[PDB]
Design brief:
The first copy, chain A, is α/β, with parallel strands linked by helices. Chain A is built from 7 helices and 7 strands, in the order βαβαβαβαβαβααβ. In chain A, strands 3-2-1-4-5-6-7 form a 7-stranded parallel β-sheet, sandwiched between helices. The structure holds sodium ion (4 copies). One sodium ion binds at residues 149, 152-153 of chain C. Chains A, B, C, D: The record marks 44-45 as: Critical for cofactor specificity.
């Protein structure tokens, strides 16, 4: 009704890393699609632009935009974005699907991506859960704080979500099942529901944060 | 429209600490009121149940419930809540307006409050910004993680918001003005907009977190 | 022989909080006494200046100085120290035996104590291990970092030791017995042996640190 | 005299990474040499076994043992140590001169090295200070905590020193000069003086710690 205080009806996101039909970016895509958002799409390698033309058959997306971007590979990211900017224009944010195998990538696209957000934006970046650590969020956390500062001046917010264990995508996570305060795991939707928060206008004065969508398990520590 | 994935239309919150017309709990009340939520109200001392019967004249709240609760004072909290439970019934969450001057209070009401959330809930707890620290979030952060564990079993989520400097409620915060990545301060609304996230269903698998609604300043560190 | 790179032969310390014959400050006193250090002595309350005139019978301390100081009570600390400065003169450091039940105390004496260290010094401050936390070191850690800065300019080093469970001074610490990497507890001597490090010249460029003398248990986390 | 509570007279250390005449390992070697310790020596590459046969001319080391070990290269580390164990026998500790360019190395030698410490030991590991971070101690800190646990059972202590900026080995560290609480930098000696602490018996119940020999600068944060 008047929960237009999200904005997000009509704004355009770039969703990256949306590998098969259980990829989290796929939950994020749907919660988003469902909320009104035009969306754009990056496929990282080959093929799967199929699972996709397919995939998008569940979403009501009246134009259908896909871009092979190998995040691994920089101009692959630069001509992705000027391509997109050519093709559809300005974005309000990009979800991104995250040594820096994956740190740099974020950094790169951050920077590429802002050229499309001239009035400003929101960039979400997710990690998932290998031993450890973390470190590994410490590092992550930090690489988002740095970006926060940078594009803060340009009114682009930058935040991370850290994604707990999700079944449908070591069966000793029966462990979290059983120690995470809510005694269950997360899935994609509940990940991409926080993504909606984060790209949306409600998270208005929030940037450089790491929101753990993980049933409460970080608290175990 | 279909951003009924917040729930929050019709659910009932207890909003505490909603001192004058610039209190943050007052932003939270309005974002909430605006979203469909019945609300209940705690006044901590005297009088102000006026600013209130008044205050609520801006909100479309067709019943009008207020309860003097001195959070400082425990049975004041116990007969607040069984009172409320008597008077209106079950809650879906309470916003709360936070040595433990204010730590204990949270703890207490957490525990009082759950007796009203039989199918479960969401409790938000805010701090604002004295020198320091923090410590002082470290401690805060922790006292929310502990509660997270406790009421996690009962499906009540528990999270904190840490609230940056807000003008309209040392003029050296001109400092944040000028170093916080977004180069501005926060107000109530943008605080209570995150509160909405947090009590709402989008923050579904999120508990024991501290979301800094502070233009990005935590990142300065 | 030439492990005069400790200094500490002849320098004068004030040892506080040296309650009975199993007090840690008592280990620190002995390791110290054994190393050559003149020592001075604070008793916090009454009596025990006995256990002491006694206690010191095990130490080869040819003068015998004791000062009732209630750390709790400030002028009790101010006329302690100008007293001492009167009575014996300049110190090279003070061991101290640590809301701020015990934080403030440190702070106070820090400040009192420096008037005696005109060429500079070393102040050690110990905590021991109630639930928790910590917080509680976070806070501690911090209150030592602040002092570090302050008296750094005046060449007084300031560090903390955090003291694990020690038997001879919940029998579920059989827990540490059994999970602390070295599979044993600490005692006083091994606490005051680090104290020697810390007041001595080897910890020369070390200040604002917290050295856990606790068989390795902090690492469990 | 009776500051034989260090042990360290006669015990044998392996000192690695002792590149030229200003290398820190070189301060550690001397403080050590000066304290009575037989020492053994690893050179990582080529040549420099010269600076060394040379270098050692300042130390009173009546036997002269050197081993080319490329830490980078594992069997280079395995036949280093069984070599040594062959050649001289059991060690009491090794100083070591530290993606894991340098993390793994530590890990490796930890494990190699213990076969020589049958009654147990002490391993020190240093980092020096590139932007950052840290992370980078977070990670370091952690990789020492893990080892702490492992060889704790076998009574080998494991700790790190983190080494501030040292002139004689960006001239914007004039910055620390001027903000580090003691208003000066550290050198090698004051690094290797803490190393002595750490390998010595005074740091008896201390393991998995990170002792910043850096004039107090960590406290700036
Ligand atoms: Na639980
Ligand atoms: Na900025
Ligand atoms: Na163990
Ligand atoms: Na200073």
């Amino acid at each position: 009704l008047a929960a237009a205080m999200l904005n997000l009806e009509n704004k355009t996101y770039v969703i990256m890393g949306i590998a098969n039909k259980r990829s989290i970016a796929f939950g994020v895509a749907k919660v988003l699609d469902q909320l009104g958002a035009k969306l754009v799409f990056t496929y990282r390698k080959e093929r799967s632009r199929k699972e996709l033309e397919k995939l998008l058959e569940q979403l009501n997306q009246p134009e259908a935009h896909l871009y092979q971007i190998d995040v691994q590979s920089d101009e692959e990211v630069i001509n992705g974005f000027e391509q997109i900017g050519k093709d559809v224009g300005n974005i309000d944010g990009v979800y991104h699907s995250i040594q820096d195998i994956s740190s740099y990538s974020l950094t790169i696209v951050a920077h590429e991506a802002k050229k499309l957000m001239p009035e400003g934006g929101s960039i979400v970046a997710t990690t998932y859960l290998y031993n450890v650590m973390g470190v590994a969020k410490a590092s992550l956390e930090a690489n988002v704080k740095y970006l926060a500062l940078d594009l803060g001046p340009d009114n682009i917010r930058v935040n991370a979500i850290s994604a707990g264990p999700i079944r449908t995508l070591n069966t000793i996570l029966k462990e979290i099942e059983e120690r995470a305060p809510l005694k269950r795991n997360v899935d994609q939707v509940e990940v991409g529901k926080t993504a909606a928060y984060l790209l949306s206008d409600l998270s208005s004065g929030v940037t450089g944060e790491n929101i753990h969508v993980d049933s409460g398990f970080h608290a175990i520590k």
